[PDB]
RNA sequence: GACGACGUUGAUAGGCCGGGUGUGUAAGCGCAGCGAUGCGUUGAGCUAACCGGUACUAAUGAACCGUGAGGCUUAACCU
RNA sequence: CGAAGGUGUGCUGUGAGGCAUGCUGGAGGUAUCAGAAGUGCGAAUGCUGACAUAAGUAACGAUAAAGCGGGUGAAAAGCCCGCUCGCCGGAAGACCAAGGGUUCCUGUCCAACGUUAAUCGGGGCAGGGUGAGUCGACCCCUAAGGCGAGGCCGAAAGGCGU
RNA sequence: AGGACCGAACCGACUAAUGUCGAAAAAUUAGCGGAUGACUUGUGGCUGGGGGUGAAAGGCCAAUCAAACCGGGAGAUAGCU
RNA sequence: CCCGGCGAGGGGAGUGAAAAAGAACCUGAAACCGUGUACGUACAAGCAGUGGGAGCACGCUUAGGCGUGUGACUGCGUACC
RNA sequence: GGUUAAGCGACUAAGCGUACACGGUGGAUGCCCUGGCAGUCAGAGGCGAUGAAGGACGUGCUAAUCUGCGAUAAGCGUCGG
């Protein structure tokens, strides 16, 4: 539970070698509305494969 | 022509804003707005509210061009601390320091 | 737990009050040192 | 170790779990759409689809059966009285799940459950 | 986190019909009893994950990283 | 037309150091030779201020319990309403004394405080509210008990007491 | 009638757990001992550091007690780090 | 004036000698923390330096080679009080 | 020129190291004074029942606190400058 001899800022870096946020670059474009949602999701205006699905 | 926008004293820590403002290093703006609109975090609330304020400083003060407009440098740097006192058990306290951070967004056409 | 300061103003007044501490000569020196050490609140007042 | 089990626990005791899925399924058919998280959306489906299954072949006894499982006759009033000819032909599924997005409250995978036949 | 099965050239999941299984004679009517209840309907009814099928809904066109015949020298075979 | 200080740089002395100079800096510095000391820091589990580490780990404070729709709003699991669900019921209900002293309420705001967000708050800004011949004290009467006119007693204070 | 029995309140702390950088500088859940007495609680006083008080443990005297705490002797002294 | 939540914060403009003097305000070192460029680095172990040293990258002189950066690999080497 | 084999063989860098340029936090250094210590020199060497030292609560155009003052309350009269 304790540290006896403080690790350098070197090894503090290499522990942070894998924290990097996964990119969500894979956007989609609508079939018959042309707008952009996230893939397998709905827009801000209720479109999903060219349908007013939620009408909100 | 070059322009810079800064949010000073953003109420978080440096590694919390370093992680999403690592992806938008060396990007164009419209792919950066689209990688920050759908990153599910709090720093993506922070700097995406400021990264759009940087392109405002282009279209208004510097180069109105936004289509082919790059982001050159972005580096979140530390700020002050709100050193409150946290109570730990058995009578002893604990000097908490609520962290605070500064972010620059630098926008130009290299 | 039953912590030590279970307070009052009736215990407080007749012990550490003005006329209590400015009764005897050994009390009076405290009122004549809190003066000279320049304290605002002399002993207890509301 | 879960190997070939089913019915996710959703981090509540069984008594709490069953009583929520009542008052979501009561809430589901009254407003016809709900926003929930992804698993509750994914597992309100496995609970509600019995109801409109056991309400096409209308009987006297199945009224209490959708009252022993519901204890809400106003929801039972919408069943058997509109839902009958609404679902004669759908041999099977009645829910088109929609993946909406992300809860700005606490980063949940939000979603949308509906009955299929929608015109309002 | 990996490995595996599928993504409308679809049985990968949920539902659904049936079977299988488990519990036992559902409810509601009629009869016999002043009554509790017993009989008939009725080995009915209800049935988690089980097994066999059915695309009913959910598993989209893309977008994406990955390229554009693969260095130097010698020997052995192509001419 | 640039003092000290800071920050690099080329030179210089056996070392402690020195001298010239680029940038930053914006009003003071001090030769040569001598005089006096709060005169040279790595340690003393030294003191004080600040910043690392463990670590983005642990934990979020009772295992009464949620779920949905609507609205306000820039953004809502937490705020306001409605609809059910669940918990307390010689209490986790409602009044009072103690003790706290605006903590109650409307408008308004979210930097900070609330172990999170927050339009909400016992938080900040502003204004408002506490109305008694009978309720409690103050007031008339004593207990335990404290002072204590004369006095007794004691280096002095002061102790006991009618 | 009972320093009588059983058992809540009230009280006390026996056993185990948990906790022991605690939710807490002595607690929480499961039990346990008593419960009209030599009991329990509230409020207001009296006693005092070589002195109080004690069904006596050197226990208690504001989380500290084989002599409390503050200031003053006093920058005690230290053949010792 | 633009962007933002008629927030915070910030970029221009204007004052001013200067806003890398802006109310956390003269000067602004070090620890600690990042940005960029250059070099080394994923078969090598060990007080992390020193002696040697290839290549690469640069300021240059003067084109003969020094200066600075890094430093593969190698010889020794077990911190201070 | 092509073909099989054999030997040898960089650029890759998730991060990390070092140097420079860049700020980021930080508030040390130099400089500054209506702050304070030690004294030289005269003077005083007291205030107090024609109510003190030290305080409470009020007073203005006012919300607050400091200074002054006291139902005559940041002030009245009076003789002067």
Q: Supply the DSSP symbol for D89.
A: S
Which positions on chain E have an atom < 7 Å from some protein CB? 14-17, 26-28, 45-50, 54, 56-64
CATH at residue B94? 3.90.470.10
Nearest-CB residue to B19 (from A20, A25, A27): A20
How would DSSP label each residue in A1-56? ---SS---HHHHHHHTTS-PPPP---EEE-SSS--EEETTS--SSSBSSS-BSS--
Which positions on chain I have an atom < 7 Å from some protein CB? 14-17, 23-26, 53-56
**Domain count of the fold of chain A:** 1
In a domain, D8, yes or no: no
Query: Which domain does A12 fall in, by range?
Result: 1-55
Q: Supply the DSSP symbol for B87.
A: P
As to burial, measured by CB atoms within 10 angstroms (0-12 exposed, 13-18 middle, 19+ buried), residue D86 is middle
Q: Answer for the pair B102, B78: CB distance below 8 angstroms, yes or no.
A: yes
Interchain touch D–A (≥3 Cβ pairs closer than 8 Å): yes
**Domain count of the fold of chain B:** 1
Query: Which domain does D98 fall in, by range?
Result: 13-116
In a domain, D36, yes or no: yes
Interface touch A42/D33, C-beta < 8 Å:
no
**Domain count of the fold of chain D:** 1
Chain D residues within an 8 Å CB radius of A54: 33, 98, 100, 112
Q: Answer for the pair B83, B95: CB distance below 8 angstroms, yes or no.
A: yes
CATH at residue D108? 3.90.1030.10
Tell me: is residue B49 an annotated ligand-binding position.
no
d(CA D8, CA B57) in angstroms, rounded, equals 51
Query: CATH 1.10.287.3980: does it fit domain C1-46?
Result: yes
Query: Which domain does B51 fall in, by range?
Result: 1-110
Instruction: Report which secondary-structure segment, H or E, holds B42.
Output: none
Give the method used. cryo-EM
d(CA B44, CA B37) in angstroms, rounded, equals 7
Helix (H, G, I), strand (E, B) or coil at D120: coil
Residue A55's nearest CA partner among D98, D106, D110 is D98
What residues does D36 pair with on adjacent strands? D111
d(CA C44, CA A34) in angstroms, rounded, equals 78
């Amino acid at each position: 539970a304790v540290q006896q001899n403080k690790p350098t800022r070197s090894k503090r870096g290499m522990r942070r070698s894998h924290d990097a946020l996964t990119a969500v670059t894979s956007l989609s474009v609508d079939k018959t509305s042309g707008e952009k949602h996230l893939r397998h999701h709905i827009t801000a205006d209720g479109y999903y494969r060219g349908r007013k699905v939620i009408a909100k | 022509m070059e322009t810079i926008a800064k949010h000073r004293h953003a109420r978080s820590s440096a590694q919390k804003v370093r992680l999403v403002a690592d992806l938008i290093r060396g990007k164009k703006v419209s792919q950066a707005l689209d990688i920050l609109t759908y990153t599910n975090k709090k720093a993506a609330v922070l700097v995406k509210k400021v990264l759009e304020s940087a392109i405002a400083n282009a279209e208004h003060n510097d180069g109105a061009d936004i289509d082919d407009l790059k982001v050159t440098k972005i580096f979140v740097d530390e700020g002050p601390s709100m050193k409150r006192i946290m109570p730990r058990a058995k009578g002893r306290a604990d000097r908490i320091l609520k962290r605070t951070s500064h972010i620059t967004v630098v926008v130009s056409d290299r | 737990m039953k912590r030590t300061f279970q307070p009052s103003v009736l215990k407080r007044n007749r012990s550490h009050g003005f006329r209590a501490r400015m009764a005897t000569k050994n009390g009076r020196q405290v009122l004549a040192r809190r003066r000279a050490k320049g304290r605002a609140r002399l002993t207890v007042s509301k | 170790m879960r190997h070939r089990k089913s019915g996710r626990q959703l981090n509540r005791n069984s008594s709490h779990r069953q009583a929520m899925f009542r008052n979501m399924a009561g809430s589901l058919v009254r407003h016809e759409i709900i926003k929930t998280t992804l698993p509750k959306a994914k597992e309100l489906r496995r609970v509600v689809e019995p109801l409109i299954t056991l309400a096409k072949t209308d009987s006297v006894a199945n009224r209490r059966l959708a009252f022993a499982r519901t204890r809400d006759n106003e929801i039972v009033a919408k069943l058997f009285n509109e839902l009958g000819p609404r679902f004669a032909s759908r041999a099977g599924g009645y829910t088109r799940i929609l993946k909406c997005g992300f809860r700005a409250g606490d980063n949940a995978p939000m979603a949308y459950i509906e009955l299929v036949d929608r015109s309002e």
